[PDB]
């Protein structure tokens, strides 16, 4: 689809089986989720944002559904204001910024 | 034109005078531009984002060109650690996310 940026761009994502409503995040790296349980094991990292660090559980090979497209990648969990779709999987759906 | 995601999408902008590399930010409302000692009234504001709350100027009807686009809004100066174009002055120049 098209999206444009008058609103906050967020769609519904299916993550661990679960719908959760993420925004797409051209600013962002990584796929931040709050806090959840995710099947598998994770490794503690830290990540740095517009306000500075905080420390997330990075879970590897996560498969998450953005609006119908699918996509199998890190994702990063740990508290964040909003659930983030960062670069790494938004190359994966094949989305492009146009204007 | 169109801008793909395997890197971070930084494109060349100008604002008071000066030439600078921002990051095209769908996550942002706002934009937020490095600490830079721009003219004009200001009013004080917090912005929040992943690791908390940072102090910024706003300052209003600030010329931004973006990538030869013309817009003109609001920009929040601050102790940001990459120049943020947000969804403020993504709307101005017809951005949009495509899949
Ligand atoms: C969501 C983080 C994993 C991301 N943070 C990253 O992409 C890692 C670098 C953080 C420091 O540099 C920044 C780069 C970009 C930003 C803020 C800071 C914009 C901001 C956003 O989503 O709007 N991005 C981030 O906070
Ligand atoms: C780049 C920042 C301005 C920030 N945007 C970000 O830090 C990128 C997304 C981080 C997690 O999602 C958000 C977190 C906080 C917000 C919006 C989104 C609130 C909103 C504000 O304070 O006005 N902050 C942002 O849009």
Chains 1, 2 share one sequence.
Request: proline share 7%; hydrophobic share 40%.
């Amino acid at each position: 689809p098209q999206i444009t940026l008058w609103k906050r761009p967020l769609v519904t994502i299916r993550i661990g089986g679960q719908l959760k409503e993420a925004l797409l995040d051209t600013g962002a790296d990584d796929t931040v989720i709050e806090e959840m349980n995710l099947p598998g094991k994770w490794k503690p990292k830290m990540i740095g944002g517009i306000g500075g660090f905080i420390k997330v559980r990075q879970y590897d090979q996560i498969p998450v559904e953005i609006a119908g497209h699918k996509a199998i990648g890190t994702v990063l969990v740990g508290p964040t204001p909003v659930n983030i779709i960062g670069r790494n999987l938004l190359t994966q759906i094949g989305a492009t910024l146009n204007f």
